Amino acid sequence: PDFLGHAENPLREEEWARLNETVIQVARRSLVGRRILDIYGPLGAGVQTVPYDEFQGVSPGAVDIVGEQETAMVFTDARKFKTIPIIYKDFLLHWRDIEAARTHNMPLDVSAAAGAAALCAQQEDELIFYGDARLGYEGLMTANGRLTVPLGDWTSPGGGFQAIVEATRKLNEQGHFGPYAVVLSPRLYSQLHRIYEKTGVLEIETIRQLASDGVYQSNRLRGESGVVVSTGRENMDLAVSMDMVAAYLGASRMNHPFRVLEALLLRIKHPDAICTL
Amino acid sequence: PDFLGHAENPLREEEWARLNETVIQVARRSLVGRRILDIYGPLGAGVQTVPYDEFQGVSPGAVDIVGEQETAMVFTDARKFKTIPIIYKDFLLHWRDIEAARTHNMPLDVSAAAGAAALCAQQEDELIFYGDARLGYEGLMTANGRLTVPLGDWTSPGGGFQAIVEATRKLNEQGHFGPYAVVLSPRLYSQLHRIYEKTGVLEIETIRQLASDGVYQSNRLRGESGVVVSTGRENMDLAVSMDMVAAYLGASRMNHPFRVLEALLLRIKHPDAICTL
Amino acid sequence: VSPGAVDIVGEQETAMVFTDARKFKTIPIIYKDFLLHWRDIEAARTHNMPLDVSAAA
Amino acid sequence: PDFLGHAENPLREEEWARLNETVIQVARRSLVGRRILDIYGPLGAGVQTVPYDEFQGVSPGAVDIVGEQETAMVFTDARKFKTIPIIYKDFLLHWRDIEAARTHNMPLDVSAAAGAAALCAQQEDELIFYGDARLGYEGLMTANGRLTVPLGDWTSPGGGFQAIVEATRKLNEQGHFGPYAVVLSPRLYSQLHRIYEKTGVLEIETIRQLASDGVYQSNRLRGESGVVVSTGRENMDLAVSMDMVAAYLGASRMNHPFRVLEALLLRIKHPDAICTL
Amino acid sequence: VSPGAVDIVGEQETAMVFTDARKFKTIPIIYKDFLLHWRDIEAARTHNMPLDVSAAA
Amino acid sequence: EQGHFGPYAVVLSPRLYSQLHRIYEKTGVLEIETIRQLASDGVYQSNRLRGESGVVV
């Protein structure tokens, strides 16, 4: 019979396979921060730690052949890797329904799961774009090397043109150049969605051709802020230990509790690539 | 190695078979409310909902080769089913016992099982006869059409007759008649058990012949009140989903917590059958 | 609104718990009715082929 | 295995074997009460019960051929066994941890495991030396049979000695002798180890040669020490059901809870060997 | 530091936490170096069986 | 009323049983018939019970 219990896997192999498929689908649609930076390789949950620092840093020298003289480069400086967080949003499945699905119904419902993952992965991005004083992190607002531009995103028609252009100026001048990506607040994006501009075509065409890796909108970024980076690797890395998954709390009073587990840590290996408002 | 618990199913097939059998023994003996109304069939845990509910009229006849006049049985008005409750009483068995029972000697204890089950089945009836503010229910005290008649008027000589006679009279007047069952608070019953009726022999034989389906004693009914109904189906139905089973809360500290699971909901499809003292 | 985040520690969930009640309010059935005429359909069953779906839509 | 559950003993056999070894190492070194009394044999987890009362008392035999009686030797007037306790201090291991050790790092972290065992074994001594009365037990502050020696008179300089002689004398009288053990609070031990006038000699050297078994210091004895005993068998016995072991609460939340289980009961088979201050 | 009595159920703190803080601060590399000379070792591979460890230890 | 009910057994002193062996009562039949039908698991006599006492379980 059922039985009751505590041996599951409350699902069976098929429904279990579904829940995983549903979660990563909805999570991936709600993740705006994995689309602006290409991911690191999976390290498994086996590693607790992701390497942390580079550059800062010195330019010169060559003569002919021997020495005269450098460097030894760097390392830079100290360690250790600040443990990749494990973030979770919890939800329960309620009593019998699952077992009603074992005979009566073919579709097993999702009380939360797609919603919780959507809530969790989003909050993950808030972790990415802001800083955390709580445990030892680099956000894209706290990394310094920001050389903060006198904002941009005016009302007057030039507006965001001058901004991103000014960004590229100092970014390039710091002695770091490459393909650029631009992240904006939705409110900024609409006010910057232009209207009109140069009389040839609109803002999307001019910015997307200027930054030229892409243009993206995040809801978790500060309303006033927006950030420009360089997508090139060995600059920033999005370090993922474990991806998004459905996990089991086990038997409880009576319930099946789940959590969604996501471990994402972003390291800034060259913090000359970051510019805020 | 050994020492058991995660665990598995820490009883064994024989011991497990016992525990189930003991529970239905004490429970069926401690249930007075499944004897006054024939039970509905078990639906399994698949259903969350128990069929419901209408009232207020009596239907026609009769007759000739003509038509109709039905005159139409029509509802009038609404839905839906108010979710069938799950009630439980929990008990634990001790770790250092069961593995001694798994085995060395054979003192395996079922004591907690029966004690909780007896208590659980008790409150189940308390749920039935009383109303429940807890979640959305009908009782035999909140079901209207009660005919809030004064009745007894007890203790001389008696009986002890006039009350039930007055009820059956009044019940019939409402246009509802049938085989009758009489439920009393235990305190009433002995005061009624009682003496000779001076005519006379017992209250039991004279009442048992008037109601003529039976006379029963429940402790959970209000002390002053007692109720007469009609056992006939399509009047009231006791909807039993999964019956009673022994279940595990899980393992805690380790030990083993158990619960007895009970789902009973009683519906009144015809509350003209209810009489309050 | 539900929590995070986070360290290798636990919990703090902090417990998603309901709180409070049930149950499902019955799913409605709505309908709009239409008729087709008798003297049509059997002419459509058939002689020519003007079969009408007009009332249906 | 990350997923999770159940009954993996989430470690592996190698890490599991270690976990046992680490616990028994730290526990055996931090137990001062198993060195003053030779242990009973392990009774297994099957038994709930430890044999109880003896002595009282002492009559000897000459003899030749026939003609020697008391004896019986009774076995003393009283039963039954008052159930051997279960004392525990628990610990959890975290999310990644162990499984991080099954991928990359060969060493398993036992930091909490042994730490709990040291704490648990500590209070175990508190159970022994103090009275309990929660579970209604003995130990020696409560054993009686002391004839209440005041002991003490240990102030200042001059020694520092007389108490233990008063003890041996009284111990000797009434007919119980053996090699003797002395237990003190650290506070007395230092107070007598000191205030060599300085003429001078030591406190340790005089007591340790007189006691002729040993002198021990426990942190858990009452501030005003102390108790003197006789190590001889059939006087006191430390009855051990289970040794120090690793047990599982078994699942909590994406973690693993452990406990260390120790069942030790000390019975007083001869309460004439006990003297307090 | 909190202790346990006990009998049957009823014993808690515990957790035993595992204390609020991570991560591991990297284990150092400390070294003192030494050299062996030109001939030395190879003089020992021809004639003399003992190797000079004077600087090593 | 104590919240414990089931099938009942009655134990009496022999002296009680005879004084309670009735005689007559309700005019239908005797005491054995009414008590044995009431307690309904059985009625028994023990000589070791207190003469005045009797017990129901």
UniProtKB/Swiss-Prot annotation, chains C, E:
Domain remarks in the Swiss-Prot or TrEMBL record: Has 3 domains; a discontinuous peripheral domain (P), an elongated loop (E) and the discontinuous axial domain (A).
Organism expressing this protein natively: Myxococcus xanthus (strain DK1622)
Localization annotation: Encapsulin nanocompartment
Name of this protein: Type 1 encapsulin shell protein EncA
Origin: domain of life: Bacteria
Use of this protein: The encapsulin and a cargo construct (an encB-encC-encD fusion) can be overexpressed in E.coli and in human HEK293T cells. In HEK293T in the presence of 0.5 M ferrous ammonium sulfate nanocompartments can be detected and used as cell markers. Coexpression of this nanocompartment with a larger nanocompartment from Q.thermotolerans (AC A0A0F5HPP7) allows expression of different sized iron-rich particles. The encapsulin shell proteins do not seem to mix.
Other known facts: Shows substantial structural similarity to gp5 of the HK97 viral capsid, and while the sequence homology is weak, it suggests this protein may have evolved from a viral capsid protein.
Quaternary structure and interacting proteins, as annotated: The 32 nm encapsulin nanocompartment is formed by 180 subunits; monomers form pentamers which assemble to form shells. There are 36 pores where the pentamers meet as well as 3-fold axis channels and dimer channels. The N-terminus of the protein is inside the shell.
Phenotypic effect of disruption: Does not form fruiting bodies. Decreased survival when grown under oxidative stress (0.5 mM H2O2).
Family: Belongs to the encapsulin family. Family 1 subfamily.
Entire protein: shown range: 59 to 115 of 287
Induction entry: Part of the MXAN_3553-MXAN_3554-MXAN_3555-encA operon. Expression is induced by amino acid starvation (at protein level). Not present in spores (at protein level).
Stated role: Shell component of a type 1, iron-storage encapsulin nanocompartment. Encapsulin nanocompartments are 32 nm in diameter with an iron- and phosphorus-rich core (4Fe:1P) about 24 nm in diameter. Upon expression in E.coli most particles are 32 nm, 20% are 18 nm. The core is filled with an average of 14 dense granules, 5-6 nm in diameter that are not evenly distributed. Each nanocompartment is estimated to hold 30,000-35,000 Fe atoms. The minor proteins EncB, EncC and EncD probably lie against the interior face of the nanocompartment.
Swiss-Prot record, chain F:
Signal peptide from the UniProt entry: none
Organism: Myxococcus xanthus (strain DK1622)
Protein's job: Shell component of a type 1, iron-storage encapsulin nanocompartment. Encapsulin nanocompartments are 32 nm in diameter with an iron- and phosphorus-rich core (4Fe:1P) about 24 nm in diameter. Upon expression in E.coli most particles are 32 nm, 20% are 18 nm. The core is filled with an average of 14 dense granules, 5-6 nm in diameter that are not evenly distributed. Each nanocompartment is estimated to hold 30,000-35,000 Fe atoms. The minor proteins EncB, EncC and EncD probably lie against the interior face of the nanocompartment.
Domain notes: Has 3 domains; a discontinuous peripheral domain (P), an elongated loop (E) and the discontinuous axial domain (A).
Cellular location(s): Encapsulin nanocompartment
Induction: Part of the MXAN_3553-MXAN_3554-MXAN_3555-encA operon. Expression is induced by amino acid starvation (at protein level). Not present in spores (at protein level).
Stated name of the protein: Type 1 encapsulin shell protein EncA
Subunit comment: The 32 nm encapsulin nanocompartment is formed by 180 subunits; monomers form pentamers which assemble to form shells. There are 36 pores where the pentamers meet as well as 3-fold axis channels and dimer channels. The N-terminus of the protein is inside the shell.
Protein family per UniProt: Belongs to the encapsulin family. Family 1 subfamily.
Recorded phenotype for the gene knockout or disruption: Does not form fruiting bodies. Decreased survival when grown under oxidative stress (0.5 mM H2O2).
Biotechnology: The encapsulin and a cargo construct (an encB-encC-encD fusion) can be overexpressed in E.coli and in human HEK293T cells. In HEK293T in the presence of 0.5 M ferrous ammonium sulfate nanocompartments can be detected and used as cell markers. Coexpression of this nanocompartment with a larger nanocompartment from Q.thermotolerans (AC A0A0F5HPP7) allows expression of different sized iron-rich particles. The encapsulin shell proteins do not seem to mix.
Additional remark text: Shows substantial structural similarity to gp5 of the HK97 viral capsid, and while the sequence homology is weak, it suggests this protein may have evolved from a viral capsid protein.
